[PDB]
Design an enzyme around this catalytic site. Structure first.
Site, PDB file in Angstrom:
ATOM      1  N   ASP A 148     -63.268 -43.843  58.334  1.00  0.00           N
ATOM      2  CA  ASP A 148     -64.410 -43.918  57.395  1.00  0.00           C
ATOM      3  C   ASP A 148     -64.378 -45.122  56.422  1.00  0.00           C
ATOM      4  N   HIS A 149     -63.176 -45.539  56.003  1.00  0.00           N
ATOM      5  CA  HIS A 149     -63.005 -46.600  54.959  1.00  0.00           C
ATOM      6  C   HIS A 149     -61.510 -46.841  54.839  1.00  0.00           C
ATOM      7  N   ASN A 204     -69.939 -39.499  46.618  1.00  0.00           N
ATOM      8  CA  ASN A 204     -69.266 -38.188  46.687  1.00  0.00           C
ATOM      9  C   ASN A 204     -69.733 -37.243  45.574  1.00  0.00           C
ATOM     10  N   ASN A 253     -90.737 -52.914  45.918  1.00  0.00           N
ATOM     11  CA  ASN A 253     -90.304 -51.484  45.898  1.00  0.00           C
ATOM     12  C   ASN A 253     -88.897 -51.258  46.439  1.00  0.00           C
ATOM     13  N   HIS A 296     -53.999 -42.136  48.287  1.00  0.00           N
ATOM     14  CA  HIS A 296     -54.309 -42.022  46.841  1.00  0.00           C
ATOM     15  C   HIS A 296     -53.042 -41.890  45.983  1.00  0.00           C
ATOM     16  N   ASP A 300     -87.222 -51.399  49.140  1.00  0.00           N
ATOM     17  CA  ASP A 300     -86.979 -50.501  50.303  1.00  0.00           C
ATOM     18  C   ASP A 300     -86.371 -51.242  51.482  1.00  0.00           C
ATOM     19  N   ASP A 338     -55.675 -40.835  54.015  1.00  0.00           N
ATOM     20  CA  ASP A 338     -56.324 -40.926  52.688  1.00  0.00           C
ATOM     21  C   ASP A 338     -55.555 -40.112  51.644  1.00  0.00           C
ATOM     22  N   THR A 387     -65.825 -41.274  51.294  1.00  0.00           N
ATOM     23  CA  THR A 387     -65.761 -40.418  52.486  1.00  0.00           C
ATOM     24  C   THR A 387     -67.109 -39.838  52.971  1.00  0.00           C
ATOM     25  N   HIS A 446     -60.543 -46.111  46.809  1.00  0.00           N
ATOM     26  CA  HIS A 446     -61.515 -46.843  47.637  1.00  0.00           C
ATOM     27  C   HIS A 446     -62.911 -46.551  47.038  1.00  0.00           C
TER      28      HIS A 446
HETATM   29  C1  LIG Z   1     -83.293 -47.332  58.081  1.00  0.00           C
HETATM   30  O1  LIG Z   1     -83.800 -46.427  59.112  1.00  0.00           O
HETATM   31  C2  LIG Z   1     -84.676 -45.440  58.615  1.00  0.00           C
HETATM   32  C3  LIG Z   1     -85.110 -44.429  59.706  1.00  0.00           C
HETATM   33  O2  LIG Z   1     -85.932 -45.132  60.619  1.00  0.00           O
HETATM   34  C4  LIG Z   1     -85.912 -46.021  57.915  1.00  0.00           C
HETATM   35  O3  LIG Z   1     -86.470 -44.986  57.116  1.00  0.00           O
HETATM   36  C5  LIG Z   1     -87.770 -44.558  57.525  1.00  0.00           C
HETATM   37  O4  LIG Z   1     -88.719 -45.490  56.996  1.00  0.00           O
HETATM   38  C6  LIG Z   1     -90.121 -45.171  57.031  1.00  0.00           C
HETATM   39  C7  LIG Z   1     -90.904 -46.071  56.034  1.00  0.00           C
HETATM   40  O5  LIG Z   1     -90.297 -46.170  54.718  1.00  0.00           O
HETATM   41  C8  LIG Z   1     -90.400 -43.697  56.690  1.00  0.00           C
HETATM   42  O6  LIG Z   1     -91.673 -43.356  57.238  1.00  0.00           O
HETATM   43  C9  LIG Z   1     -92.382 -42.493  56.302  1.00  0.00           C
HETATM   44  O7  LIG Z   1     -92.228 -41.115  56.653  1.00  0.00           O
HETATM   45  C10 LIG Z   1     -92.879 -40.194  55.770  1.00  0.00           C
HETATM   46  C11 LIG Z   1     -92.500 -38.744  56.113  1.00  0.00           C
HETATM   47  O8  LIG Z   1     -91.122 -38.615  55.818  1.00  0.00           O
HETATM   48  C12 LIG Z   1     -90.519 -37.325  56.122  1.00  0.00           C
HETATM   49  O9  LIG Z   1     -90.332 -37.059  57.526  1.00  0.00           O
HETATM   50  C13 LIG Z   1     -89.301 -37.771  58.238  1.00  0.00           C
HETATM   51  C14 LIG Z   1     -89.231 -37.338  59.724  1.00  0.00           C
HETATM   52  O10 LIG Z   1     -88.621 -36.061  59.945  1.00  0.00           O
HETATM   53  C15 LIG Z   1     -87.953 -37.647  57.495  1.00  0.00           C
HETATM   54  O11 LIG Z   1     -86.936 -38.426  58.098  1.00  0.00           O
HETATM   55  C16 LIG Z   1     -88.072 -38.017  56.006  1.00  0.00           C
HETATM   56  O12 LIG Z   1     -86.787 -37.903  55.384  1.00  0.00           O
HETATM   57  C17 LIG Z   1     -86.711 -38.571  54.081  1.00  0.00           C
HETATM   58  O13 LIG Z   1     -87.092 -37.763  52.956  1.00  0.00           O
HETATM   59  C18 LIG Z   1     -86.262 -36.641  52.650  1.00  0.00           C
HETATM   60  C19 LIG Z   1     -86.690 -36.180  51.264  1.00  0.00           C
HETATM   61  O14 LIG Z   1     -87.558 -35.110  51.513  1.00  0.00           O
HETATM   62  C20 LIG Z   1     -84.741 -36.929  52.673  1.00  0.00           C
HETATM   63  O15 LIG Z   1     -83.972 -35.749  52.873  1.00  0.00           O
HETATM   64  C21 LIG Z   1     -84.304 -37.970  53.726  1.00  0.00           C
HETATM   65  O16 LIG Z   1     -82.984 -38.402  53.419  1.00  0.00           O
HETATM   66  C22 LIG Z   1     -85.302 -39.146  53.799  1.00  0.00           C
HETATM   67  O17 LIG Z   1     -85.300 -39.841  52.549  1.00  0.00           O
HETATM   68  C23 LIG Z   1     -85.399 -41.283  52.648  1.00  0.00           C
HETATM   69  O18 LIG Z   1     -86.714 -41.747  53.009  1.00  0.00           O
HETATM   70  C24 LIG Z   1     -87.760 -41.406  52.065  1.00  0.00           C
HETATM   71  C25 LIG Z   1     -89.167 -41.750  52.601  1.00  0.00           C
HETATM   72  O19 LIG Z   1     -89.512 -40.958  53.735  1.00  0.00           O
HETATM   73  C26 LIG Z   1     -87.441 -42.061  50.701  1.00  0.00           C
HETATM   74  O20 LIG Z   1     -88.381 -41.680  49.717  1.00  0.00           O
HETATM   75  C27 LIG Z   1     -86.029 -41.672  50.225  1.00  0.00           C
HETATM   76  O21 LIG Z   1     -85.710 -42.464  49.111  1.00  0.00           O
HETATM   77  C28 LIG Z   1     -84.941 -41.870  51.300  1.00  0.00           C
HETATM   78  O22 LIG Z   1     -84.614 -43.249  51.432  1.00  0.00           O
HETATM   79  C29 LIG Z   1     -89.193 -37.196  55.321  1.00  0.00           C
HETATM   80  O23 LIG Z   1     -88.765 -35.843  55.147  1.00  0.00           O
HETATM   81  C30 LIG Z   1     -94.394 -40.442  55.774  1.00  0.00           C
HETATM   82  O24 LIG Z   1     -94.961 -39.524  54.871  1.00  0.00           O
HETATM   83  C31 LIG Z   1     -94.716 -41.899  55.366  1.00  0.00           C
HETATM   84  O25 LIG Z   1     -96.127 -42.190  55.446  1.00  0.00           O
HETATM   85  C32 LIG Z   1     -96.741 -42.697  54.205  1.00  0.00           C
HETATM   86  O26 LIG Z   1     -97.042 -44.091  54.221  1.00  0.00           O
HETATM   87  C33 LIG Z   1     -97.948 -44.466  55.266  1.00  0.00           C
HETATM   88  C34 LIG Z   1     -98.192 -45.974  55.223  1.00  0.00           C
HETATM   89  O27 LIG Z   1     -98.118 -46.474  56.543  1.00  0.00           O
HETATM   90  C35 LIG Z   1     -99.294 -43.705  55.261  1.00  0.00           C
HETATM   91  O28 LIG Z   1     -99.858 -43.678  56.561  1.00  0.00           O
HETATM   92  C36 LIG Z   1     -99.203 -42.251  54.797  1.00  0.00           C
HETATM   93  O29 LIG Z   1    -100.450 -41.935  54.213  1.00  0.00           O
HETATM   94  C37 LIG Z   1     -98.058 -41.979  53.803  1.00  0.00           C
HETATM   95  O30 LIG Z   1     -98.510 -42.408  52.521  1.00  0.00           O
HETATM   96  C38 LIG Z   1     -98.803 -41.295  51.631  1.00  0.00           C
HETATM   97  O31 LIG Z   1     -97.690 -40.984  50.795  1.00  0.00           O
HETATM   98  C39 LIG Z   1     -97.389 -42.011  49.850  1.00  0.00           C
HETATM   99  C40 LIG Z   1     -96.035 -41.750  49.182  1.00  0.00           C
HETATM  100  O32 LIG Z   1     -95.978 -40.415  48.731  1.00  0.00           O
HETATM  101  C41 LIG Z   1     -98.571 -42.153  48.869  1.00  0.00           C
HETATM  102  O33 LIG Z   1     -98.327 -43.116  47.861  1.00  0.00           O
HETATM  103  C42 LIG Z   1     -99.866 -42.506  49.622  1.00  0.00           C
HETATM  104  O34 LIG Z   1    -100.948 -42.587  48.696  1.00  0.00           O
HETATM  105  C43 LIG Z   1    -100.092 -41.530  50.802  1.00  0.00           C
HETATM  106  O35 LIG Z   1    -100.573 -40.282  50.340  1.00  0.00           O
HETATM  107  C44 LIG Z   1     -93.859 -42.902  56.186  1.00  0.00           C
HETATM  108  O36 LIG Z   1     -94.350 -43.084  57.499  1.00  0.00           O
HETATM  109  C45 LIG Z   1     -89.339 -42.684  57.167  1.00  0.00           C
HETATM  110  O37 LIG Z   1     -89.481 -41.434  56.522  1.00  0.00           O
HETATM  111  C46 LIG Z   1     -87.909 -43.144  56.912  1.00  0.00           C
HETATM  112  N1  LIG Z   1     -86.924 -42.190  57.486  1.00  0.00           N
HETATM  113  C47 LIG Z   1     -85.732 -41.875  56.961  1.00  0.00           C
HETATM  114  C48 LIG Z   1     -84.852 -40.888  57.734  1.00  0.00           C
HETATM  115  O38 LIG Z   1     -85.282 -42.349  55.914  1.00  0.00           O
HETATM  116  C49 LIG Z   1     -85.469 -47.125  56.952  1.00  0.00           C
HETATM  117  O39 LIG Z   1     -86.606 -47.875  56.552  1.00  0.00           O
HETATM  118  C50 LIG Z   1     -84.474 -48.118  57.609  1.00  0.00           C
HETATM  119  N2  LIG Z   1     -84.026 -49.088  56.599  1.00  0.00           N
HETATM  120  C51 LIG Z   1     -84.102 -50.452  56.786  1.00  0.00           C
HETATM  121  C52 LIG Z   1     -83.634 -51.379  55.702  1.00  0.00           C
HETATM  122  O40 LIG Z   1     -84.530 -50.951  57.835  1.00  0.00           O
HETATM  123 CA   LIG Z   2     -90.790 -53.409  50.396  1.00  0.00          CA
HETATM  124 CL   LIG Z   3     -69.671 -41.473  44.026  1.00  0.00          CL
HETATM  125 ZN   LIG Z   4     -60.098 -40.921  49.368  1.00  0.00          ZN
END
Ligand SMILES: *[C@@H]1O[C@H](CO)[C@@H](O[C@@H]2O[C@H](CO)[C@@H](O[C@@H]3O[C@H](CO[C@H]4O[C@H](CO)[C@@H](O)[C@H](O[C@H]5O[C@H](CO)[C@@H](O)[C@H](O)[C@@H]5O[C@H]5O[C@H](CO)[C@@H](O)[C@H](O)[C@@H]5O)[C@@H]4O)[C@@H](O)[C@H](O[C@H]4O[C@H](CO)[C@@H](O)[C@H](O)[C@@H]4O[C@H]4O[C@H](CO)[C@@H](O)[C@H](O)[C@@H]4O)[C@@H]3O)[C@H](O)[C@H]2NC(C)=O)[C@H](O)[C@H]1NC(C)=O
Ligand SMILES: [Ca+2]
Ligand SMILES: [Cl-]
Ligand SMILES: [Zn+2]
Ligand SMILES: Cn1c(=O)n(Cc2ccc(F)cc2)c2cnc(Cl)nc21
Ligand SMILES: [K+]
Ligand code: NA
Length: 805
Positions: A308-309, A180, A685, A265, A687, A261, A159, A420
């Protein structure tokens, strides 16, 4: 602490939520134990129930009634939803003929058609057919509006991850709600269905619809309802909000139902007990529609009816226990049920080892009903790895089963009959979508699609710019009468080089050999033409893939195939070839078994070498264009070019060779020819996105030849299979896969048998969308077709699921 001594007078279901210690009057105050003392008396009236009766018609307003039948109720906005039917001779909405809504018909002061999301928990796709007799209101929305035969949820099919994906357009790995139940090791905090932790905003990533709207000056109703607020009161609250003054009135609203749902269950998806909950949800839809009709909004509002599912048959007797596999069962924590997630019980236990846990769980019992994976090895279509809240060790549980740690977990916590959470391609987990209103199409069936695509559409419905998300914006344009989003194709970033013959054979010292020394003008001009692209129209049917990042690469033409060869990764980014229905399969001739040939168009410095493969005792090689499908013995030599070679573990070559020798020709036979694009993926990595060179963890020993984590193929033919793939006039048909490049076949418990008994099963499990491959490669496919761009976007989101109908 809350000062519950305040009052809800004039505040019932207020939109802005007040902060502690002031008492609250909003639709969530009950969940926080924070309602003002008089919230029940004032805001949750029940007197005389939910329906007008003839005797109440024209009554003197009594403010204590749950809803009103007095003459002033339409202006007050608080009539019972059946008021005009009982008292003013009107028909129920469901009894009215379907009539096309060509343009919005809205009251004065409405700036846009409102959006109402009607969400239903555990509403399995097949209820639309199987329950049709007891759901007239829902069946009318479905047949009169736009519907899909089913909508695919995200994994896990639970959910909170699904509702929040609907709200954000994001995979659970990106939005952070990955189950969940969760543990975040950075926060050192646990999220549970029950309790206060889940209210903390730090769990909830991305930007959900209500925030997108508010930030752009579109007002939103609250999307969450305390469980004890009855459904009739939720509907009446929505209809009251719709009577607010223009500057106060939300434009988007959500209703949520815990049914079917909750009963599913208890009773299983088709228990006889399930008819009543379906009837009850239908009645709630009727209340909403009658209520919109009274407000003159029934041809103004866009309504989405979405689940949802689904729900599967699952009983306590179908539980696998880890205590029957592991010696050390007390050293692990298990997140249990329809999926498993395993981590160490203690971070101080240096004798915890994931390798031994995985081995102890792998193909140990003949009918084993779960399969273990390190998360990076899960099918890429699940997009379930790139989050610290996702444990490294994952168990994919078979439909109809549970996994638990020990037997005592199941009886000290049969009860339930449904559950589910399983793999999102499983038929029983599929859910519903219907869209009805002026902006949706009239009496239109659309193909199944993924719930990650809906956020973009809901933004389009509201004139909002979506936050960055995982939908492919434009892929659902065919659901919409207007407000379509018309994207442009991405610009190519790197342009290819087109090398001619530049190197003599003796310049290469690659340690390769080939028995190819046999020596005609009738054919010498012909070979030159093939190297310059004379057959390219046959083998590259939809234009060359565009490279959307900065790199150095060459286009290489051949009689039988075309490739884009990366000077940086020393191998093709993509290899494209067409196989007709009439194509013949041949063998690799004995004298060519170990043949590898320098490519005189590509410098020794930018080529692989055979010595590295000889020295690397774990790593062998295969070919992207298969030598088995060469058009002639002479063309076959091109398939052994060093520029068509890729690194492959021997265990993987069993899979690849069967695909290339048996399956490609089988698909060409069945589909009337196929076009195949194959290549490597590097995602070390995990990702979901193309790795740069500096992220690569493994090379062929002693060399700069990078090792792919996966190999893809995209297999395209004519949807009208009376036309051959290379002469197709209309829409296309695609299937694709992303196969993991692994050093063993431990995933396939039957791998010691002939490839005919296990390889195609593996490939089906790793089915993929073209869009998944695009993310993983930085390539953009289908750039030159005769099809509209939105249609191509829909094709790129297609997943071939291999479930029955
Ligand atoms: C699906 O769609 C989504 C959305 O478009 C795609 O995800 C995006 O992908 C981008 C690349 O991976 C990523 O861009 C990065 O943003 C960094 C800043 O992030 C913060 O700000 C945004 C904007 O408000 C916010 O959305 C982020 O939210 C994440 O993190 C919080 C945790 O605090 C969570 O609550 C949230 O759920 C979300 O987590 C998810 O994403 C993070 C990564 O951001 C993962 O770690 C989690 O596991 C989870 O999946 C953040 O609050 C920015 O800092 C990055 O820049 C770095 O890299 C570039 C290289 O180009 C460089 O210029 C910079 O220097 C920097 O590197 C430095 O930091 C490195 C790591 O610490 C370090 O090693 C270096 O040495 C450097 O110092 C980067 O631009 C974007 O954040 C996410 N957005 C979201 C919402 O997830 C996703 O890819 C799509 N999927 C597919 C399959 O297509
Ligand atoms: Ca990769
Ligand atoms: Cl779960
Ligand atoms: Zn259920
Ligand atoms: C986790 N989660 C959400 O994201 N929403 C809002 C929501 C999102 C999409 C939608 F289609 C309707 C409502 C929820 C409402 N109710 C509950 Cl029990 N859980 C929810
Ligand atoms: K080797
Ligand atoms: Na095996």
């Amino acid at each position: 602490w809350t000062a519950t001594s305040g009052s809800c007078k004039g505040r019932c279901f207020e939109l802005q939520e007040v902060g502690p210690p002031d008492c609250r009057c909003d639709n969530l105050c009950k969940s926080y134990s924070s309602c003002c003392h008089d919230f029940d008396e004032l805001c949750l009236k029940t007197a005389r129930g939910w329906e007008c009766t003839k005797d109440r018609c024209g009554e003197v307003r009594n403010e204590e009634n749950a809803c009103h039948c007095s003459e002033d109720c339409l202006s007050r906005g608080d009539c019972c939803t059946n008021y005009q039917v009982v008292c003013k001779g009107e028909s129920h909405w469901v009894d009215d003929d379907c009539e096309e809504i060509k343009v919005p018909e809205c009251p004065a002061g409405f700036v846009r058609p409102p959006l109402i999301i009607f969400s239903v928990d555990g509403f399995r796709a097949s209820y639309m057919k199987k329950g049709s007799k007891v759901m007239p209101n829902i069946e009318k929305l479905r047949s009169c509006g736009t519907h899909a035969p089913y909508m695919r949820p995200v994994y896990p099919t639970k959910t909170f991850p699904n509702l929040y994906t609907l709200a954000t357009g994001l995979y659970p790995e990106s939005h952070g709600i990955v189950g969940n139940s969760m543990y975040d090791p950075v926060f050192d905090a646990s999220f549970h269905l029950r309790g206060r932790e889940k209210f903390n905003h730090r769990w909830w990533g991305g930007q959900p619809l209500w925030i997108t709207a508010t930030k752009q000056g579109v007002r939103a109703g609250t999307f969450f309802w305390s469980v004890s607020i009855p459904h009739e009161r939720r509907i009446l609250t929505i209809l009251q909000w719709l009577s607010l003054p223009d500057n106060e009135r939300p434009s988007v609203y959500a209703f949520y139902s815990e049914q079917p749902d909750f009963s599913g269950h208890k009773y299983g998806p088709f228990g006889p007990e399930m008819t009543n909950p379906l009837r009850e949800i239908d009645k709630t839809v009727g209340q909403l529609m009658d209520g919109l009709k009274q407000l003159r909004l029934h041809r103004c509002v866009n309504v989405i009816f979405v689940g949802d599912h689904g729900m599967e048959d699952v009983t306590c007797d179908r539980t696998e226990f880890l205590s029957n596999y592991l010696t050390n069962v007390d050293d692990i924590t298990l997140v249990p049920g329809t999926l498993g997630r395993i981590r160490a019980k203690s971070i101080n236990n240096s004798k915890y080892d994931p390798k031994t846990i995985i081995a102890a769980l792998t193909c140990k019992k003949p009918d084993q009903h779960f399969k273990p994976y390190m998360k990076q090895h899960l099918p890429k279509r699940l997009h379930y790895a790139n989050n610290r809240r996702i444990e490294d060790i994952h168990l994919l549980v078979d439909r109809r089963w549970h996994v638990a740690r020990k037997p005592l977990d199941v009886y000290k916590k049969c009860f339930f009959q449904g559950d589910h959470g399983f793999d999102n391609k499983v038929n029983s987990m599929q859910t519903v979508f219907v869209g009805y209103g002026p902006t949706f199409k009239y009496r239109t069936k659309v193909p199944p699609f993924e719930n990650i695509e809906l956020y973009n559409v809901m933004c389009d419905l509201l004139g909002l710019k979506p936050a960055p998300n995982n939908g492919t914006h434009g892929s659902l344009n065919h659901l919409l009468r207007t407000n379509t989003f018309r994207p442009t194709m991405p610009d190519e970033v790197s342009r290819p080089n087109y090398p001619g013959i530049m190197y003599l054979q003796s310049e290469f010292d690659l340690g390769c050999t080939c028995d190819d020394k046999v020596e005609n003008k009738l054919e010498e001009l012909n070979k030159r033409l093939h190297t310059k692209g004379s057959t390219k129209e046959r083998h590259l049917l939809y234009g060359r893939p565009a490279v959307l990042y900065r790199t150095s690469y060459d286009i290489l033409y051949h009689t039988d195939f075309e490739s884009g060869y990366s000077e940086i990764f020393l191998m093709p980014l993509w290899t494209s070839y067409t196989i007709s229905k009439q194509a013949e399969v041949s063998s690799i001739p004995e004298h060519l078994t170990n043949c590898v040939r320098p490519d005189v168009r590509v410098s020794p410095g930018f080529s692989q070498n055979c010595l590295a493969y000889k020295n690397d005792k774990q790593m062998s090689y295969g070919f992207l264009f298969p030598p088995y499908l060469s058009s002639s013995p002479e063309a076959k030599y091109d398939a052994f070019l060093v520029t068509n070679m890729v690194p492959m573990y021997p265990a993987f070559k069993r899979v690849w060779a069967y695909f290339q020798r048996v399956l490609v020709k089988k698909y060409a036979s069945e589909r009337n020819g196929v076009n195949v694009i194959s290549g490597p993926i590097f995602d070390y990595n995990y990702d979901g996105l193309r790795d740069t060179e500096d992220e690569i963890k493994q090379y062929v020993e002693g060399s700069s030849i990078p090792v792919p984590t996966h190999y893809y193929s995209i297999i395209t033919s004519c949807l009208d299979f009376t036309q051959p793939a290379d002469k197709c006039d209309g829409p296309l048909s695609v299937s694709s896969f992303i196969l993991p490049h692994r050093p063993d076949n431990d995933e396939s418990c039957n791998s010691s048998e002939d490839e005919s008994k296990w390889v195609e099963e593996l490939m089906k499990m790793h089915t993929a969308r073209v869009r998944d491959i695009e993310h993983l490669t930085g390539l953009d496919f289908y750039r030159k077709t005769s099809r509209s761009y939105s249609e191509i976007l829909t094709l790129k989101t297609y997943l071939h699921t291999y479930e029955s109908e």
